[PDB]
């Protein structure tokens, strides 16, 4: 029975950790966690890990 982080990454965009029995998301360096606490938002240009558009 896939729970928490094992079910579709816990709805997290990047890192997911099971803390207590809840999911806690976080983000690589150069991103911040959005208000919803799930999505990761780039805080500069040229964030790590993206193919470049310009």
């Amino acid at each position: 029975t896939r729970k928490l982080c094992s079910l579709d990454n816990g709805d997290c965009d990047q890192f997911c950790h099971e803390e207590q029995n809840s999911v806690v998301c976080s983000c690589a360096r150069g991103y911040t966690l959005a208000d919803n606490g799930k999505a990761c938002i780039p805080t500069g240009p040229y964030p790590c890990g993206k193919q470049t558009l310009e």
Binding site: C5, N9, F15, C48
Partner: protein
């Protein structure tokens, strides 16, 4: 890379190229930050003095975007050993910062447990380089990429003439003629997760290129995350 495809504009921007005095590429590398390049330690014996090229896709022609950077500090893993290629990982700190731009940008470092659990359990990752197009061939003048499936750890050990340590992992194809090859070493192995790319390995060695029943051997980056964090200070 044997097989695979060209990296098209903006597709492999974390690729670095270690170039010798003769100014030709001999090893790849991965861009971690504006000052730090990840590479294989075995690459550090392949030239007396070297620089790092970034933003290059076609080494015959200058599309304005390339820049060469000199190396200020080499940090080889204390335990690398030529004999087994165990601990095949070095960090380079550049004298001058990389300016990010089209075709130049870092790959992300994942978190250890998430990475082992989520990234290395995907089907495939992506390796890229300017190395040989066949075992006996010449280095590619075009930067190439190739999707390679993660390989079962047991299968891999069965396949290999040599010891596969806990710091290594196998990726590649059993019979399909697709593989990294000589010159790709030190280069990135990245795993995509939802539109974001994470470093997962360093191109280390294989028994020739694309041989039947043989796989590529990658340094397991997740075993070295604390160490890299330390190297970057």
């Amino acid at each position: 890379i044997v097989g695979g495809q060209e990296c098209k504009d903006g597709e492999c921007p974390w690729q670095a190229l270690l170039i010798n005095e003769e100014n030709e590429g001999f090893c790849g590398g991965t861009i971690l930050s504006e000052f730090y390049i990840l590479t294989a330690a075995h690459c550090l014996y392949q030239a007396k003095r070297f620089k790092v090229r970034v933003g290059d896709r076609n080494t015959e022609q200058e599309e304005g975007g390339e820049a060469v950077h000199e190396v200020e500090v080499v940090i080889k893993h204390n335990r690398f050993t030529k004999e087994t290629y165990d601990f095949d990982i070095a960090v380079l700190r550049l004298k001058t910062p990389i300016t990010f731009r089209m075709n130049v940008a870092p790959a992300c470092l994942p978190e250890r447990d998430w990475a082992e659990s989520t990234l290395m359990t995907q089907k495939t990752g992506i390796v890229s380089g300017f190395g040989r197009t066949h075992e006996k061939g010449r280095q590619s003048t075009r930067l190439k990429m190739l999707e390679v499936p993660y390989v079962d750890r047991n299968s891999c050990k069965l396949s290999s003439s040599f010891i596969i340590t806990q710091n290594m992992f196998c990726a590649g194809y059993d019979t399909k003629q697709e593989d990294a090859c000589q010159g790709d070493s030190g280069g990135p192995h990245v795993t995509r997760f939802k539109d974001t790319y994470f470093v997962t390995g360093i191109v280390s060695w294989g028994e020739g290129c694309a041989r039947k029943g043989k796989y590529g051997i990658y340094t397991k980056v997740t075993a070295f995350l604390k160490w890299i964090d330390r190297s970057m200070k």
